[PDB]
């Protein structure tokens with residue numbers, strides 16, 4: 001047991017944080033002591049305070065924290081089987097989850113590879129695509145193509161398709177694989193961007209295993225939205241040039257953008273698809289890669305005879321059990337109305353920010369609201385300002401944004417957006 | 430789902446570790462429960478109890494469903510399932526980091542939490558690369574190892590895995606090209622160390638780090654080597670200014686007779702990975718540790734941070750049960766317990782030496798190996814061990830076990846008796 005000052009002291013000396021230093025942190029982390037529903041209990045000046053988790057703890061807590069259906073599923077599975085190795089064994093929570101995932105994902109995705117994080121599931125997708133083409137006698141098809149502004153994780157193959165500027169690729173000269181980058185995909189649809197994407201793809205087709213993109217919403221690389229018709233063009237280009245299509249739905253999955261999967265906004269099925277952040281409802285680390293029967297059978301008939309990947313905790317019974325409950329909980333309610341109501345609350349609550357002087361754009365897509373500013377947001381100002389108004393907000397670069405839990409009441413959504421407007425206002429003064 | 434429905438769902442939709450879809454020689458076995466050292470499997474449609482001789486792939490060091498660990502999980506479930514580690518810290522993370530810093534080899538003072546072993550290896554490599562970039566030497570970007578190793582399934586991890594075990598022939602022109610020394614021998618030979626140093630010397634200017642499994646190489650062949658080899662590496666790396674990374678993801682937490690296998694040699698790496706047994710086999714979690722010198726140099730360099738941060742970084746649920754698992758090991762006389770297990774393994778497997786198809790039998794801590802002159806046929810071995818109440822999963826030519834630390838002498842004699850029989854069926858056909 002540690003007091004908050006003991007925690008801060010341990011943390012300052014021994015704990016790395018995401019994309020952080022040791023010893024050169026401008027602002028200390030805030031101690032978290034509880035989380036229930038949409039609310040975090042944080043320690044501010046020795047005093048516990050309840051604030052709204054407007055970030056859904058980094059896209060994860062779609063049902064809020066400590067939801068009874070998900071707590072219950074965890075403890076139930078813990079009573080019977082915490083974990084067993086997946087090599088040579090199978091179990092009910094894997095079979096239930098996989099049956100769920102093949103049924104609700106874009107059509108044709110019929111096999112499920114479980115792993116422990118989004119980055120790994122992206123590497124697994126790349127491995128599927130590479131082994132698929134080696135199973136076709138075309139080992140030269142080993143590069144990847146994407147469009148700028150994307151983010152696909154932090155392991156070294158995942159990095160190679162992240163936005164070169166956003167992903168600081170200048171720091172990894174002669175280290176990252178050299179992939180093919182198309183220009184930033186625009187917000188509005190423009191058949192000339194698609195024509196130039198195809199023209200660029202056409203000169204790399206024989207060395208391309210796959211096109212890899214986030215569908216409709218690009219997260220960590222800029223919180224940018226783009227017209228779903230672009231994904232329809234990508235599906236057509238990939239079909240005609242025989243390059244596999246891979247959708248990274250690790251951020252967009254499970255209703256977050258107003259459709260169950262963001263690919264549903266275009267009616268597109270990728271050959272391969274990754275899911276992750278909201279898969280467990282924010283309880284535990286879990287991720288999944290799905291492919292079509294065609295990909296699976298080509299890999300399985302190739303010279304390797306198998307997919308050469310196998311995480312230690314593959315298909316962990318506990319993680320799968322809570323994921324089964326989170327997915328069932330979501331499908332058991334009218335999630336699309338819920339998301340629509342969240343979107344309209346974000347849109348209504350954020351409109352006033354458009355007239356703020358340092359604000360260049362406001363945009364909402366499903367349960368995602370973005371205030372885009374004209375200068376980088378100072379976290380040392382923004383974070384305590386939002387805590388002062390009862391909201392946990394985490395700006396990044398010039399963006400003040402929220403992806404709040406689906407269980408947020410309309411009054412709670414208005415409290416979130418109000419704190420976002422006031423952060424935006426402080427930015428410009 | 431019934432067992433028959435599980436197997437049907439599984440065969441259609443579920444990938445397994447290093448497996449095919451639709452071409453599996455043998456169906457997986459349905460696991461329905463796991464408690465203590467025992468799994469409950471479905472054979473002939475009926476639940477049977479068998480010993481988890483593999484500790485569920487090195488994980489279940491305290492057995493499944495240990496009441497102390499179940500209760501640590503449920504306790505933390507009541508308070509906080511998860512919050513984001515960007516901008517927040519919490520007591521499970523501080524408690525675990527303080528434990529890990531104090532029990533690991535001297536000098537490892539900072540902890541980077543991730544969700545799997547392969548990710549923790551990529552983090553260590555990223556640590557080493559950013560270290561040398563922060564020292565002005567970006568040319569130091571390659572890794573060196575000895576053959577026979579395994580470090581995970583992500584693409585950078587793959588690049589330092591044994592080329593044959595890791596089937597690098599399938600990956601020509603894909604993997605980063607690393608520096609391999611010959612297989613490290615079992616018995617200590619100073620000429621091996623001189624040849625490693627001479628090879629490293631001509632690469633020292635382009636090498637960021639040596640990466641090895643200390644004492645025991647796992648998935649690459651279950652081979653053991655004299656710890657004096659690790660003393661030699663610490664000296665070579667020190668003198669040639671190349672970082673030393675120990676991969677303790679399978680050897681950690683008492684498995685080889687010392688708390689960490691580095692302690693057999695009395696040396697500290699600069700960077701250290703741990704993972705498989707960290708949570709007592711409950712949940713996915715891993716950690717990468719580095720010295721203060723590495724952390725300060727990364728943080729003072731041009732990037733000013735470590736460019737990594739997974740979504741579920743430092744997950745409260747996984748950290749809580751890991752704190753309980755670690756303190757549970759430390760709160761008993763684990764060194765005697767492992768010594769008793771090693772003796773039980775040696776006494777039980779001795780008779781295998783006489784079998785006509787056995788070329789070696791070796792034990793190291795809670796690890797026992799029978800190496801055969803032929804490959805072990807899983808279609809014969811797995812039912813043969815099942816019929817004797819033991820779950821064994823041979824690999825290539827190896828019949829081996831890594832039993833839970835809670836195994837009684839009668840359970841060990843039962844496991845080893847099963848292992849001897851599998852080897853007897855090998856030299857028969």
Ligand SMILES: O=C1CCc2cc(N3CCN(C(=O)c4ccc5c(c4)OCO5)CC3)ccc21
Pocket residue numbers: 018019057058149150151152162163166167168220221222513514515516738739740741742
């Ligand atoms: O709380 C958490 C858990 C994961 C996390 C990542 C965080 N991010 C902050 C740093 N990030 C980045 O700057 C970043 C890295 C690579 C990129 C990128 C952005 O765009 C394209 O490629 C992305 C990760 C912040 C907080 C948290």
Ligand SMILES: O=C1CCc2cc(N3CCN(C(=O)c4ccc5c(c4)OCO5)CC3)ccc21
Pocket residue numbers: 085086087088310311312313314446447485486577578579580590591592593594595596648649650
């Ligand atoms: O039950 C599980 C969880 C993870 C797992 C890996 C398993 N292994 C089966 C196949 N393996 C291998 O053949 C293997 C792969 C890469 C290598 C290697 C061996 O030596 C150097 O590089 C190692 C992975 C088997 C079962 C299970």
Ligand SMILES: *Cc1c(COP(=O)(O)O)cnc(C)c1O
Pocket residue numbers: 117118119120122151152153154214219220248249250251252276277738739740741
């Ligand atoms: C967060 C994210 C990842 C990485 O997942 P981790 O669990 O952090 O490894 C990959 N792709 C996308 C689109 C993401 O949003």
Ligand SMILES: *Cc1c(COP(=O)(O)O)cnc(C)c1O
Pocket residue numbers: 310311312313545546547548550579580581582642647648676677678679704705
């Ligand atoms: C199992 C293992 C890994 C990879 O861990 P995962 O959790 O399966 O990704 C890495 N290194 C070593 C030595 C291992 O034994």
